[PDB]
C-alpha cells in the first residue's frame, strides 16, 4: 500500500535524538513480534506432529491392505492348482 | 530507521503503532501540513474507489435480478 | 444532530499554537478512520467476488436449461413429422 | 480546523473522540460556562423530547389493548 | 440513597480555579449522558415504528373479520326471506 | 455546581464518576478525615443492613422448610 | 492473612504526609466497597422477595389441602351414619 | 492507617490494590530490600506447599488406580 | 531461554538508582505471582478433596462386593454339605 | 536484580513484563544498538526456523497425498 510508503517518506524528510527514540519504538514492536512468532512456532510444531502421526497410521493401514491382498492371491492360486 | 520499517513490512498493526508513536514550531507545522495533504489525497482516492465499486455492485445485483427473472420467464 | 455545529461555533468563538495542536489531534483521529475505511473496502471486495461467482453459476445453469428445452422441442417436431 | 469537522458531518466514535479531546483564566472560565449552559439546555430539550415519545408510545399501547379487546368482543 | 447528598455537602464545605475544572468535568459527564440519551431515543423510535406496523396489521384483520360477519348475516337474512 | 449534579441525579453511574473525580494541606487533611469517618459509619450501617436481611432470609427459609414438611406429613 | 500482617508490619515500621495520602486512597477504596455493598444488598433484597412469594404460594396450597381433607372426612362420617 | 486495612480485611481484591499502590533515600532502599527478601521467602514457602500437595495428589491417584485394578480383578 | 540470558548479560553490562527501580518492579511482578500461586493452591486442593471422596466411594463399593462374594461362597458350601 | 530473574526463569508472562519495563545519551545509544543487533540476529534465526518448518510441512503433505493415491490405486 502506498500510504505506508508516503508516511515513511514524510518522516524521512522530517529527519533530514530522534533516531534513538525511533529505534526504541522499533525495539518495542520487535519484541511484540517476538511473542507473536513464538506463538506461531508452537502452533506450527503441533500441526507438524499431527501430520506425522496421521501419515504413519496411513502407512500401517496400507501395509495391512497389501498383505491381505497378497494372502488372498496366494490362496486363490493354491486352490486353482 | 525507515529501512527497518521496510524490512518489517516486506516480512508480511505495525503501521498503526508507528504512526501513533510519530504522533521548532515552524518545522513542526510544515511537517504536519505535508502529512495532512498526503492523507487527504489518499482519503479522496479511497472514496473514489469506494464509489466505483459501489456502482459496480449495484450493476451486478441488477444483472443478477434480471437474469433470474428471465430464467423464471423461461420455465 | 446539531451538536457538531454548536461545538464548531463554540470552538470558532474561542479561537477568535492551539491551532497546530488541534490539527495534530484531528490528523491522528483521521489516521484512526483510515483503518475503518480499509476494513470496509476488504469486506465489500469479498462480497463483490461472491456476487460475481454466483452470476457465472446462474449463467451456466440458464444455458443448460435453454439447450435442453431446444433439444426437447426439436425431438418433438421430428417425431410429429 | 472546523472545516474538517464540517466535512466529517456532511460525509454522513470519531466525532466523540475529537469533541472529547477538544473539551487567560477569565476567558477560559467564560468559555467553559457558555459550553456548560448550552449543553444543559440541549439536555433539557432532549429530556422533553424523550418524554413526549414515551407518552406517545404509552398511548399507542393503550389503543392497541382497547382495540384488541373490542375485537375479542366482536368474536 | 443519601450518600450523594452527604458528599455534596462535604464538598461544599471544602470549597468554603477548582470550580472551573469541576464544571469542565461536569459538562464532559453530561456529554456522555447526551450520547446515552441519543441511543435511548433511537431505540424508542424503533419501538414506536414496530407498534405502528403491528397496529396496521391488526386493523387489516379486524376489517376482514367485520366484513365477513356482515356478509354471513346478510346471507342468513336472505335465506330466512 | 454541586446542585446541578443533584438535580441531574434526582432527574433519573453518575455517582461513581463524580466521586472518583472529587478525589490547602490542612484543609484537605481535615476534609479527608471527615469524609473517611462518614464513609466508615455508612459502611458499618450497610453491614448492619446486610446482617438484618440475611437473618430475615434464614428465618424465612427455615419456616418454608418446616411448613413444607408439615404439608408432606399432612398429605 | 500472613502476607497482610507482614506487609502491615513493614509499612508501620517504614512510616515510624504519608498518612494523608494513604487515608485518601483508603477513602477511595472504601467508596468502591460501598458500590459492592449496594450491589449485594440489592440482590439479597430480590432473593427475600422471591422467598416471600414462595411462602405465600405454599400458604395457599396448604389451606386448600387441609380444607379438602376435612371435607372428605365429613363426607365419610356422614355416609357412615 | 494500617489498622483500618486489617479491620477491613478481617471484616469480610483490597489486598492486591493496596499492595500495588504501596509499592530518607537510604531508609527506603533498605525497606525495599527487606520487602523483597520477605516476598522471596514467602514464594519459596508457597512452592514448598505446592510440592507437598503434588506429592499427595500423585499418591492418591496411584492408590486409586491400584484399588480399581483389584476391584476389576475381584470377579 | 537463551535470549533471556543474553538480555540479562547486556543489561548487566549497561548497569554494572535504576537498580532500585528494577528491584521495585520485579517485586510487583512477584507480588502478582503470589496471587497466581494462591489460585493454583486452591485449585489443587479442590482436586485433592474430589480425589479423596472418590476414594471413599470406591472403598464402599469394594467392601460390598467382597461381602457379597463371601456370602455366595458360604451359601454354596452350605448347599454342598 | 539479574539473579532474581535468572532464578525465576530457572524455575520454569515474566519476560513480557520485564522486557516491557526495561525497554547518558552515548551509553543509551550504544546499549540500544547492541540490543538491536542481538534481537535482529535471532529474529533472522527464527525466520530461518519458520521457513524450514514450512518446507517440512510441504514435504509431509505431498507424501500424504502420494500415499493416499497409492491406497486408492490399490483396490
Residue numbers in the entry:
A (entry chain P), C (entry chain R), E (entry chain T), G (entry chain V), I (entry chain N): 50 to 65, 105 to 169
B (entry chain Q), D (entry chain S), F (entry chain U), H (entry chain M), J (entry chain O): 33 to 44, 52 to 62, 103 to 154
Question: How is this structure described in the published paper?
Answer:
A separate protein complex, the terminase, associates with the dodecameric portal and initiates genome packaging and the concurrent autoproteolytic cleavage of the scaffold.
Only C-capsids ultimately become infectious virions.
